[PDB]
Amino acid sequence: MELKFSAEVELTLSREVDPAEIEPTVEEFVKEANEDLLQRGVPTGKEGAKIESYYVLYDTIYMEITGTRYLRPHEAAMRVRKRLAERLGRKHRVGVRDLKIPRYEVVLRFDREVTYDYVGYVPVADDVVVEDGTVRLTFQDVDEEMLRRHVIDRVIRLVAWAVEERSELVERVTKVEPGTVVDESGPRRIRFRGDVTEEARRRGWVKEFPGRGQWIYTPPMAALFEVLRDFLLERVTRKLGFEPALFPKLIPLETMFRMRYLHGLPDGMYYVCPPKRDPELFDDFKRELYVWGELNERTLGSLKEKLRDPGYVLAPAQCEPFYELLRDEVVDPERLPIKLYDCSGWTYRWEGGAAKGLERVNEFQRIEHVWIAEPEEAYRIRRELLEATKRVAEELELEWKVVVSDDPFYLEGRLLEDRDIELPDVPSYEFEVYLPFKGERSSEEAWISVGSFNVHGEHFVDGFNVKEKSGRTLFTGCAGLGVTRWVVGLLAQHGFYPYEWPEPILERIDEKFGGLPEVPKTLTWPE
Template sequence: MRFALRGYFELSDVLSDDAVGGVRRFLGEIGDAVFKKGAPRGKEDEAARLISWDVRGNRFYVEVESGRYVRAHVAFVRLRNALAEFLGSRFGLGVRGSRVEEYVLEFELDREPLEPVNVLFAKDVRFDGRKVTILLEDLDDVALERNYPDRIIGRVREKVARQFVSGKGEFTRVVRRSNKGVERYVLKEDPTDLAIRFGWVKEYPATGVWQIMPPMAALIRAMEKLIVDEVAKPLGFQEVMMPRLIPLEVEYRKGHFGIANEIIWACPPVSRDPKDFEDLVDYVEITGGPPPAEFLREKLRPPLYGLSYAQCEPFYEMFHRETVDLDALEEEPIKFYDRNGPTYRWESGGVRGLERLNEFHRVEFVFLSTPRKCIEIRDSILERTERIVDEVFDLEYRVDATTAVYLEHAGKMEEEGGGDFVKTYDLTAILPFQTKSRPEAELEIASFHVHTDFYAKRFHFRDKKRRTVFTGCAGLGPSRFAYVFLVRYGFDFENWPNEIKKYIGEKLPEPPRMLTWPKG
């Protein structure tokens, strides 16, 4: 690795000849403390070194180079701080700020990239086999204090590493499969068209969003109640109502900017003053139609929130910078479940049926405790959910151990086999047909996670004795449960199992009837 920078420190005044001489002596005295401190013994030649310095007006220019240890930008900041202290105490001068004009970073990757990558803030990124050369320009104090250079290197490594994986399938292994087969399923094709024809759902002018009519609503609510009765209550989970507007700072801590392309963002109006919207109202009233999107955009602020993607984001924010007692949480873990309205994901053009939606319903389980207890809780939720899918739904299903989804969301990578326990399980229902949205004869209907201390670190909460705090979550989808249930049992209420009918009553609600709808 090689790092070479040119930059300057902005001084509060011009240095006198006496001050320049003092600085020369000072630099000779503090060299090792600034440039080599922290380098391993025997590796001092890979630490930073001051190549040159010069004073022009009230700017103190330097060139710094380094190898792997005490990288040039770290030494540059150390020198700025040491120089500020020296000039302040000896000559009454201060350092107002610093700037790196040019910074060249050279390092090697583990593997030659399949294709070049770019990264924000880099003027240029060049590849020569496994060797990478990055050119950065005009880095200010914020970029240096927040260590942009090392973060940029890490980002390039992550982007290249992701070229060699193909998503969940890369790290997925089958844990168990029910092997019941799908021959006894009532439906042999996607139920979406039948649901439309029978009036169970109605199309809506928004991608991946449906109007859920009384019979389908009754079925989805029955699934929700089943989950609460068979999973949440027996395991001691308490119901909470978590917000669905997620502020940008919470999205950041959750790691969701790694999936910004999948989040639906919320833009509040520029003001509450009707006068600011008078021309927009004029347009609508005069043209008799909605305004162009560009016209409306002028009336909106930039995004301030994301609509909840995972449902569990507010849970971790609840503990932001708080201290917990793991002795108490070992005996009585924090265990909540939430069903406070829909979850939102932007599936774009990949939604055609009822199985993959932009707006859907989930029951989210979240928990916080010791490592042992969190693994135990997660496994208990999985066990009880499997029992529903196997004994009540009578489905062919599969349980997979797969990539930790919270790392995927944050744009991070995980090596296969990392850790001594499975972080993520997916529960997938096997179908007798390919779904409308994807060419797959299966549908993931639930997932179960142990996050290790990933969110404890990102949200800065800790145990009073600084022991490792784990969290976990599980998402069970009543919408998808209803979908696979219809595939298995069909639309005839009389043929449904009593475990579901008891939540609905003696008969299924009827859809509204119009002269032109439904068609069936």
């Protein structure tokens, strides 16, 4: 892919000028610039920058400057500015007050067939033209900030990526085919065929909440949840010696950005905006509310105006605060490993659609284990964790498989292929549990993931600038257990009649709850 730049540069002189007196100097400069300055740094076989033309108006000198990857037009402009202004200053007592790039054009010549639909959306350009297997990108009024931040450079990288069809996902990193079953519990005799959501709605173990994806869990359901969770903490989390933590469920949009998670699933998160400072805006709002007496376009639009820009996301990962914890810190193997868990609250995923599954919800509860160590140690914690969980699933008499996770959570986007970092051969494993009411065991939709076990390699260690004293390689990982999910699976397999639930569960129910609590019936509702 040949790549060629052309810029319209404008040098604004300190005062008006009579060009005829100036040109002699510009001509001389330009000629010697093309010969020397704009060939400097260019490798022997290649082309640099040339000032292709110039002209002098009363305020300005206008230049056509062309470039190559070896020397780019604005870098050229930089080399020219300071110099041509010293000459102008010495010869004519005139400087260059400002320098601007009204038009900056880049042409990418392809061997591949290209058309608009191949390219797609091009983020920063004012024009995109595709012709003759060529992409002409034009940028108006280019800031020094764009240039410093290599914004155009990345646009180019993008357009290349978009044309080369790299977007087809077998192109992705994981070494082992997802779906691949590492481990299996053979089938248990099949004890319950009932539909957990429908049955739970029936008996009112959940009542549907007004918001999409959400539910109210009434006491029998909640008692199950409590002990199920407590039993998980006892058998796995606490047994493997993870120490407790309280992590924020409200996560700064910038933490999301550092993780690259924002790049990955921007459409699967909820966004959160806080209120503006000025208390009178809300005095006024309160007034609009009273007068309209409802939420409508007017009041709801007026609400938006009193809000700030979105600065947070309701936490989907559930492990984020941990990288903020280690951020910019330096570790010693005597301080390693670090193993924390958090069971504080609800974790959110926005899925659009019929939200009607109890097995897939927007608001869920999970135990998040999180850890950092040298990578041999790093991968063992995940192994132990898996073995730990397998044993629990057995104690809960559940049918389960462990398979290679289909996609990395923090990998769920692509062009991040831009960096370079050390990654595990198998980033993510899923602990799946069979739900009989969904179909025969062969069917992948009859299994839900009740937990994911991930080694991250160096990914977050890098973005959060976590280092080791020596400089040893550091790895992180997280595992988490959707307890909401484990509950559904327990019901799906063992059914709703409590005396047929697993032993450790009955005991927990009885001791803490004195029997399985009953639905808070009304006359109308439970039905």
